[PDB]
DNA sequence: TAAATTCGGATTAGGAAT
DNA sequence: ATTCCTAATCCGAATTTA
C-alpha cells in the first residue's frame with residue numbers, strides 16, 4: 001500500500017532538505033513523450049496503486065504545495081521527467097500568512113497560531129459561518145481574550161473553512177483574486193470570458209498550483225531550446241500553460257481538451273493576452289476525441305513533446321459527501337481516457 | 353434562469369494512549 | 371492488535387436571489 005511521504009516534499013522542494021537528484025524509471029516509462037499526471041493525494045485506498053499500475057508502475061511524487069506558497073495542496077504527480085536541476089520560477093509567491101495577507105495583522109488574534117492556509121477548494125465558507133464566529137466572539141470584546149472553549153470553536157472553524165481575519169471578529173474566506181495569486185496565476189486570469197464569480201471559485205479550486213507544476217516542468221527548458229508541442233488534457237484554466245509561460249518555454253502548439261466553455265474562454269484569453277505566437281487548438285469532450293484525431297494531429301504538427309493533465313477528482317476528494325466512490329466514478333474514471341490518449345501518443349513516438 | 357447561497361459527514365492517516 | 375483522539379479535504383444537492 002502506497003504510503004504518503006512525511007514531509008510531503010516529493011523528490012525535494014526549495015529551501016528544504018532531502019533533495020534527490022536521480023531516480024530509476026521502468027524502461028516502459030521512458031519517453032518520448034514526456035507526460036505529467038496530477039490528482040489529489042488523499043484518495044480512497046487503492047486509487048494511487050491503480051493509477052500507478054496504468055502509468056507504467058511509476059511511483060507518484062507526492063508534494064504539498066505549502067512549500068511553494070501560503071496554501072497547502074497535497075497532490076500526487078506521476079511523470080517521466082528528469083528530476084535533476086529543477087529550478088523555481090521567480091519571484092516565488094509569499095510563503096506565510098503574515099506576508100501573503102499584509103493587512104491581516106490588524107485583525108489577527110494572538111490565539112490563532114496559523115502561519116499557512118489549508119487547501120484551496122471549490123466550496124468556501126458561508127456568510128452565515130462568518131456571522132456565527134462574529135456572534136460567538138463579541139461577548140468578550142472588552143476582555144483581553146475569549147475563553148478557551150470559544151477559542152477552539154473559532155480555530156476549528158477557521159481551519160475547516162480556510163478563513164482569514166478581515167475585520168473586527170470577522171473571519172471570511174479567500175476572494176477569487178487571492179486564490180489566483182496563491183495558486184500562482186496572474187491577477188484577473190479568471191475574470192472575463194463569461195465566467196461568473198461562482199465559476200471562478202470552482203475553476204480555481206480545481207486548478208494547479210502553478211509554482212509547484214512549474215518547478216517540476218523546469219527541467220524541460222534545456223531539453224527543448226526551440227519550444228514544445230503540448231497535448232493538454234483536462235486543461236482547466238490553463239495551469240500547465242501558465243507554468244510553461246512562466247518558464248519561458250515556447251509553446252509551438254497546444255492541443256487543449258477541456259469540456260467547460262468558460263474555461264476554454266479563459267485559456268484563449270490567456271493565449272491572446274500573453275501574445276503567444278504558437279497555435280492553440282481547443283477540443284471540448286475528451287470522450288469524443290478519437291485515437292485517429294490524435295494521430296492526424298501528430299502527423300500534421302510532428303508529434304507531442306509533452307502530455308500534461310489532471311483528470312477529475314470529484315469521486316476521490318474527501319469533501320464529496322455523495323459520490324466519493326473512487327476511481328471508477330462517473331467523473332474520475334476519465335483518468336482512463338488520459339491513459340488511452342497517452343498510449344496513442346506513445347505508439348507514434350516510441351513504437352510497438 | 354444564471355448566479356449566488358447554504359447546507360450537508362465520511363474516508364483516511366497518524367500519534368498517543370492502553 | 372484495539373481505543374481514542376486530532377486533523378485535512380481539487381465536493382453535491384437543493385434552494386433561493388435577482
Ligand SMILES: Nc1ncnc2c1ncn2[C@@H]1O[C@H](CSCC[C@H](N)C(=O)O)[C@@H](O)[C@H]1O
Pocket residue numbers: 203206207208234235236237238239240257258259260263284285286287309310311312313334
Ligand atoms: N469529459 C471531459 N472532457 C474534457 N474535459 C473534462 C471532461 N470532464 C471533466 N473535464 C475537465 O477536467 C478538468 C479537471 S480539473 C484540472 C484543471 C487544470 N489542472 C488547471 O490548471 O486548471 C476540469 O476543468 C473539467 O472541466
